[PDB]
Symmetry: D2
Subunit: 445 residues, 4 copies
């Protein structure tokens, strides 16, 4: 009654209870109903959440994801559960099994990608395994033996096929590949996507989340689904997409995560005596994408910009993605101090009306801000976790600690919500969201 929050032990227990409850056997759904399949970057965070519970099962989560890797190295953003419906677009709509030459056999997947947080999950698994003794280390090391090549092929596909011009930024062909479907970042690029005759469909997502203020609009879904038509028309061929896609953007946040992931995987490579050529390529990509991210930045504030490849235009918006350079490093000293002032100030974590000192997905002072509407404003625990972990890696121990503390305070209601209203703290999106439980589990230690 007086305090509906849970203690740290109750919260850790409920988080673990949730993760096991979303386990289908060898894959964990991203949420019970809204996302009843395996999503790529959710699966990485699920592996992080499972590592304190079972290193073996955390490795299983990544093995399942990597078993769905495309022939060319791409990790698709959905690995569909066998016989499960209730998410749209589902496998019939993607038609990758029939159309895509590089699609896996004996797995059904989507035909687009998602950010490469996977190396970070591998590091957390290895860190847990090393505290657990010989048998558990052997599990994690056997996973490295079995999957190091697949991880390399994933990073190599990103570096070679989504950065064809060696600019150090990743090109996306769908806003879904950013992880942030309706971010204001993509609005001006989506405005130039004009659907042709689009085959009939009915959304599933807003049958589960019925409050229209919390999900994208019908007109946005028409553009999301039209881009699918464009990809299917060229049978998901990498070489043909640049010629046909109505949406081609360089995603600076994805690019910064890739830089970090390359550096992380390179250090794993050195510690576990992987091939020197692989380690050298990883360090090369880490520096290439760090530089690519820095090249986008405002010289006064450090804020990173996305780039619309079709319009040949920097995309200037006020979202959390602006803070990409903080994740990967590389900014000059003065510019990074300015970027931190922006982060901590009244446009983001310093905004006087926020319930928690956390990073809203869109600045509350932006014209684009909508406090309930998915990536247009709400506070996302997954981002809080990713920022806190990257900040700790930068050496910003107190900044990381504060994000963790506020994230745990927000999460102490036990809803494990997908995102939270930034002013009232109301849980929004799906409840029982796996990567929110995973963030809590990793934080609580």
């Amino acid at each position: 009654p007086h305090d509906p929050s849970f203690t740290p032990t109750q919260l850790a227990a409920r988080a673990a209870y949730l993760l096991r409850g979303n386990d289908l056997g060898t894959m964990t759904t991203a949420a019970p109903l809204l996302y009843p399949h395996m999503w790529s970057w959710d699966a990485a965070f699920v592996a992080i959440g499972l590592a304190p519970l079972s290193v073996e099962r955390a490795v299983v989560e990544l093995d399942t994801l990597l078993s769905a890797q495309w022939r060319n190295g791409m990790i698709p953003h959905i690995v569909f559960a066998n016989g499960v419906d209730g998410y749209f677009p589902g496998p019939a709509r993607w038609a990758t099994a029939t159309l895509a030459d590089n699609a896996p056999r004996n797995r059904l997947t989507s035909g687009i990608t998602q950010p490469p947080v996977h190396a970070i999950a591998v590091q957390r698994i290895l860190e847990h395994a090393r505290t657990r003794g010989r048998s558990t280390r052997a599990v994690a090391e056997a996973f490295l033996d079995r999957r190091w090549g697949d991880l390399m092929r994933w990073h190599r596909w990103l570096a070679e096929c989504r950065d064809r011009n060696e600019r150090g930024r990743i090109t996306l062909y769908h806003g879904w590949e950013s992880g942030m479907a309706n971010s204001p970042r993509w609005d001006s690029a989506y405005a130039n996507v004009v659907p042709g005759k689009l085959p009939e469909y009915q959304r599933a997502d807003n049958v589960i989340i019925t409050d229209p203020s919390q999900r994208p609009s019908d007109g946005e879904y028409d553009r999301y689904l039209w881009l699918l038509e464009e990809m299917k028309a060229v049978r998901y061929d990498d070489e043909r997409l640049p010629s046909v896609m109505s949406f081609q953007v360089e995603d600076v946040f994805f690019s910064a995560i890739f830089s970090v992931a390359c550096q992380v995987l390179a250090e794993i490579g050195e510690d576990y005596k992987r091939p020197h050529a692989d380690v050298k390529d990883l360090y090369l990509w880490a520096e290439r994408f760090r530089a690519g991210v820095v090249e986008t930045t405002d010289q006064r504030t450090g804020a990173a910009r996305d780039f619309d490849v079709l319009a040949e235009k920097w995309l200037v918006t006020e979202t959390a993605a602006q803070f990409a350079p903080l994740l990967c490093g590389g900014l000059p000293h003065d510019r990074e101090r300015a970027l931190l002032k922006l982060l901590e100030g009244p446009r983001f974590c310093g905004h006087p009306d926020l319930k928690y000192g956390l990073i809203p997905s869109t600045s509350p002072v932006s014209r684009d801000f909508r406090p309930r509407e998915y990536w247009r404003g709400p506070v996302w625990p997954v981002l809080t976790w990713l920022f806190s972990w990257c900040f700790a890696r930068r050496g910003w121990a107190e900044r990381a600690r504060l994000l963790r503390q506020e994230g745990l305070r927000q999460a102490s209601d036990g809803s494990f919500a997908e995102y939270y209203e930034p002013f009232t703290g109301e849980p929004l999106g799906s409840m029982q969201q796996s990567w929110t439980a995973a963030a809590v589990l990793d934080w609580l230690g």
Copy 2:
């Protein structure tokens, strides 16, 4: 490496992870492999462990158990999982579905009972639900509406059919009904059980636990299975068992739990406006069994004795069951002080070689003590929990706290072992034992 123990949050998370992992859907197995079905008093403890995680699912656990209640009110000690093998004796051996007129329809069960800890689980569910607000209170109250009569019929069957002579002690027809299969308590009664021609069988339990030092002997299993033959021969008829059973003992520990359970259920009855006649009967039974327990006690030490009904003999052994009167109250002041001195002294919790200050199942100084052998010596987390909870209810806050603290220290290895070696702390029995995880979850709060 240096410290393989888990933090309170890691331990709570792993305990919850385990409980959900043993969940078959509407019943939780007592262990993954050794006990791959629902056991009656394990199910009560599972409900206690689930209450901090999901009041709804805790209620489901008790609903499933009570759906298997016999027509006469008996709660059987096993509710078998549909299609699951691997425990022996299984349903084919009991043959209750074919033979027992009072057996449930559409559930397969054993033909014997187990201690009535269920009311304690109901109290813990209600206590959790009241901290969680209106909707959760409604779940727990709807369970009371739906199951109060079944709980009454359970207590009434114990009081009327297993205490036919109104002595205030429960008669058992199998040592398995005590929850303590090979306790030294039953050795002299088992010595008078002479098997006839016993149908061939092969144990399953020692295929899973292969160390022979940790389980009962083949000769003990022959007697356990012969008693089954005696019960089947009279088709599990309550009225016929006293005439045919080679094993008839009054179990003072079971009797003390019943007294406590009656008092607990009576208080629930008063708080939730149940029928006055039911509450009055519960208080009557609570006092009858408190007196029955006290009547067994040594006048100098307070230690409670079991009674062999066939031999007409008090059973004097040195096991944790001696402390029955501490659970239910009723001893004169001087005698209870003596009993506490026995508990805290060098024969039990004070023994100088114990790794933890916990109650061994058999006194280490007894000729009967075997440090690995099931109920002949090891320390059982389930007993630690039951003693700590009953002690707190007596008002012995520090004694309860110390048992909890030592139990948590012992459990901090994360094996969730069925029992522990009292000197080395080695985990024994089944790992991943559900009621050990439940004790940890309840303790950690």
Copy 3:
């Protein structure tokens, strides 16, 4: 910032820092400025708070108090610090050094008493000492050897000199002896106190606490100080007080504390082989004062009434002292259930406007309620602690737990306030109050 509360470790650290900061050497002040001397029941709580930090120093605190015990057994409510000013009435006003035949030599004290919580502090010291090993047990046991007789003389003085008619209730000659100066309990007795020629004085308390809404009025202080004149006029002679005092009340809360303290001290005496005649007397007094408390109770609600000895009338008020019978036991079952319903319902802990689920000193629905005014409404951490500890000793583990949880939530601001505003949680009275820090330290474990 977004949440100014302290973590448990920060709170425990700050509580201990405070207690050591208030240590003058061999006595701890009750607060830094408002109460810059040793008060008797504060000193008991200080000893409880010191026990987790230093058993030696906890023992010193009680040794210092008992060194000021009067020749007849009375423990006076203030032991003044040598050469310290800033509290009024000071030693000159009491004039016990010169007037009181029973006052101690080479300590300056007041001339009235306070509740006998001291045995509870001895129990907590012994419980800590027993967890700390041999040298620490030796310290606590030596304190018992040295002070058991003084503790007996304290209890004997209460039983013989403040319960002259063996009614099982303690008579007070000053409202200050209740520990609750301006409780509504005493208003009708104080209305019959008419000061004669009262020597001029200036208050000190409201120089420190200047907000007039938080302290008693000048008119009340005139009565407090006039009662001192009546005592001085008979030189504090126990035999003459009944003939001259304008204020003579039986305090049912003090009486219930005394019942509990006698039972606690008797159990200590048994455990440490103290003289049997002493233990027998303690148990006799425990039951006499239990019965005396029960005799006062409302036949419907169980609520305990104080008694005005001069007016020969029961004093019916709506304060926390009504709950005296819950501390010591003795109510018939049905009436204790009614009393608990009153405690947990909308007149006390269930009042809908309370910030915390805690017991206000006066019911918010009473015409006497004043949310800021000392004992006329505020929530006192010292009472939360006493009720929680007594409730645990009754066996009401969950009720005790809930009081401790809410008390720790309230105290997490780190002000260690004397009392708190019941609706807003505003800290009131002296900050850095020693017994509030002691409560927190005992709770946090």
Copy 4:
């Protein structure tokens, strides 16, 4: 009992109780008896430990130290408490009041310096203050206004007067200035110190710590005290010390601490708009002393060497000071990996006989190792803390976490020992050492 360790809250409480117990008013002694005055780098750590308890009192600690700063900027290593005896050499032996032109007025101090950890304490005070709201921020900011210039003069004195040749390393004229009196680092330099006519003296330190195995030898003390005679003979004149001192070493650990402290203080200066010329000088010194540390390093292992200025030779020893480059950064990637391998391997934290995974002051495999003898082997909580904090600032979050976890495990006995036996965990040196309590308080959060 079965486990004498304290819970986190009990430990935090006892640490704070200790720190307040060692408070003389405006300075905290480094220990109760062994070190009954203010030491300079202890005072910095005391301020860190006080910051979670009282930002005001933490600031006072540094104000008291800086009030004893010499005219030339030097912070002396002892500020003597007025009229306190029991440490030798005391103020009479140093004779700085009468001989040293730069000694402060109305403070008594020693005549040598100690490592510049002070900026790290300022950062922790500011970080706490920023979580506590406006009044507390005002206190910390006022301290910066009042003392920024003194902090600059301290850093300037080190950079200009103890690095006269701009080598980026700090020259010591006494092994006591390293904070590590009897480190094997200094043995070959001390072998070239030949006392002349040394005035008679009696040690005080080994009257308190009487076990000869835990303190330096008489022969070492003769050399410590003779160096004082050489300084007094030139009246502590900075310009004359190079011409007369028999001990002149470049201390690479002190140098690395100075690099870190300059970087930390420069960031503070930027954040609080201090003069730009000061910030520029601080960053210049941070990089100069980083480079100076790196220049000393082994080309295979990265291990840092001290330099004997008189012998013009690198000092190669196997102590924790080898790890200086991990604190300040600057090693090439491959050599820093080698240095981390040395730290985590069998010569240091991975030695198989260590009770805790912590850094011994001297390698257990070195011929110089002595497991009880002050800096010749014991594990020092102060160094665990410094390494953990510096490692977190490098971004090595898991390495920092592991040091803190093991440090808290070691400290959970509550002795707050000066140092610990590396194999048995036996507390050694002074108990109730202030900077050990400070480490614990900072860690527990």
